[PDB]
């Protein structure tokens, strides 16, 4: 038998696919990157599965159909051409292990600069004043 063709919902960096069968079918996936990370399951009835797709993503097959491949795009809510509350919402929501790093580095650079300026101008008022 050919199973009943599922119904997909394309979110940000994932898919969700409502499935509805009544004889047990076999859902098999993999990611197409370097780490495949496979997954297989038998399902009956009516369920909903969520799967995080990456930039090199995700071929799933489901119950002896032909396979189907899926690639994810670099959407996000925000703009990199805008005010600073719209740019950080675009980068931290896509690479949170970099955005916080460069923000911390920038603020520590400001604090370092204002601290050495504040101490050296007080040195200049001291030593130029006998």
């Amino acid at each position: 038998p050919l199973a009943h063709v599922p119904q997909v919902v394309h979110g940000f960096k994932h898919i969700s696919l409502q499935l509805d069968t009544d004889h047990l079918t076999l859902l098999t996936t993999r990611r197409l990157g370097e780490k495949p990370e496979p997954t297989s399951e038998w399902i009956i009835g009516k369920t909903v599965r969520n799967f995080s797709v990456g930039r090199d993503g995700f071929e799933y097959i489901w119950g002896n159909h032909e396979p189907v491949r899926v690639w994810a795009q670099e959407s996000a809510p925000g703009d990199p051409h805008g005010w600073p509350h719209e740019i950080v919402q675009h980068y931290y929501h896509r690479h949170p292990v970099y955005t916080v790093m460069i923000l911390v580095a920038a603020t520590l650079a400001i604090v370092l600069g204002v601290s050495v300026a504040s101490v050296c101008v007080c040195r200049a008022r001291r030593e130029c004043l006998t």
Binding site: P38, I61, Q73, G78, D79, H81, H90, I110, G113
Partner: protein
């Protein structure tokens, strides 16, 4: 002429390049890898099935005795049970063999060494296409009618396989079968055989003959399941469905068809009668570029207009020179006054690239916008880059903040020199 570049190994993504030598119109070049399989060198140790143990009609003496040794057969348990059937004696020898049918359902415990790479390259140069196939080692020339192609060694070698493998009906398993002749019973590899048809089965089967106790003649044996029969229940997912680059595995010679890894360096050797001199190419003066949509990242999210001025009605040949945009269709039938379009394909927020129409090089400045479509049937035709996937306004903010964190320090060291040298 001789030109040398590095195709990326992702199949059915075309790749654009210009080859230009002096005194000649730059002609186009597209090199699409249409198929690629790595074939390893394999050799099989043994062949397994289920036993259907010969359960012969036993040998029974009513008053005499039997001392039955082994004939040249497999696992027996040629056991010679004493006083039975009321002395009398029965020498039951339920010796294993192959099943009633191993030509249909058997296994081949194949060992696998290191592998090759073919390709199936399609090269379009000028007005001619060429279908070939070339071994990806840096020496063997796969040739068309007239051009000689070599393909360098791969950046990084990769195998979907392992050292020891098992071929069932159609499928392929990375499992660690025992050696030849040193097997254990219960597990895979009870019966061993160098082929289906040859002699010399070697078995350790955990067959156990049992002393009969009934009113009629039978022979009771117990056994484990055949290790083949139990491996048919214990096996996970073949290598068709867990292979680490999306490659698909079809086996008459056990190849790993259509992988995607690394990048081939090509080194082509173009014929000399495809070029044409600049005394026959149309000139082009003064390009300009309106730029339209620029939805980035997708497939072909870009439009621009090339505004040109030529002499004849010929065919020019367009190519983007920077790497952060790669256009499409690579030739333009120009006219004398005209404005025909292109299709940029960036994956960065700044369409900031360099186009040469027929040799006259200009730039395209723009701003790209994120797409509103989350998941798409086509693989990415670029790779991201630091210092190119970061928008200009964010560079202005970073340089403003981190440079104002240092201009006051420069003013502080001028305070050093001023207060220390005047006093």
């Amino acid at each position: 002429f001789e030109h040398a570049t590095t195709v990326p190994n992702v199949p059915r993504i075309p790749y654009k390049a210009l080859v230009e030598r002096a005194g000649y119109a730059p002609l186009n070049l597209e090199i699409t890898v249409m198929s690629s399989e790595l074939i390893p060198s394999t050799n099989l140790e043994y062949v397994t099935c289920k036993y259907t143990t010969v359960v012969p009609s036993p040998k029974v003496k009513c008053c005499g005795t039997l001392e039955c040794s082994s004939a040249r057969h497999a696992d027996y348990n040629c056991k010679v049970f004493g006083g039975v059937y009321p002395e009398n004696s029965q020498m039951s020898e339920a010796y294993v063999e192959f099943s009633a049918d191993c030509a249909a359902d058997h296994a081949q415990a194949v060992k696998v060494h290191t592998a090759a790479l073919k390709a199936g390259l399609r090269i379009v140069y000028g007005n001619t296409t060429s279908m070939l196939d070339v071994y990806v080692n840096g020496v063997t020339p796969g040739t068309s009618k007239d051009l000689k192609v070599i393909a360098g060694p791969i950046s990084a070698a990769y195998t979907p396989f392992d050292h020891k493998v098992i071929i069932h009906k159609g499928k392929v398993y990375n499992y660690d079968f025992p050696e030849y002749g040193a097997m254990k019973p219960g597990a895979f590899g009870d019966i061993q055989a160098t082929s289906l048809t040859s002699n010399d089965l070697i078995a350790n089967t955990d067959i156990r003959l049992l002393k009969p106790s009934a009113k009629n003649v039978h022979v009771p044996y117990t056994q484990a399941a055949s290790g083949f029969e139990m491996w048919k229940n214990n096996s996970g997912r073949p290598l068709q469905e867990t292979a680490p680059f999306g490659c698909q595995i079809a086996v008459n010679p056990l190849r790993a068809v259509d992988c995607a890894y690394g990048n081939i360096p090509i080194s082509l050797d173009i014929p000399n009668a495809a070029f044409v001199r600049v005394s026959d190419a149309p000139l082009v003066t003064a390009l300009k570029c309106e730029v339209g949509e620029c939805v980035y990242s997708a497939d072909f999210g870009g439009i621009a207009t090339l505004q040109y001025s030529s002499d004849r009605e010929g065919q020019c040949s367009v190519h983007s020179h920077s790497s952060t945009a790669t256009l499409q269709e690579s030739t333009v039938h120009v006219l004398q006054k005209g404005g025909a379009t292109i299709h940029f394909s960036t994956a960065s927020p700044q369409a900031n690239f360099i186009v040469s129409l027929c040799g006259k090089k200009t730039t395209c400045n723009a701003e790209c916008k994120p797409p509103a479509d989350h998941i798409v049937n086509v693989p990415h035709k670029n790779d991201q880059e630091f210092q190119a996937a970061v928008s200009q306004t964010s560079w202005s903010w970073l340089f403003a903040l981190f440079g104002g964190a240092s201009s006051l320090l420069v003013i502080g060291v001028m305070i050093f020199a001023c207060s220390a040298l005047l006093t």
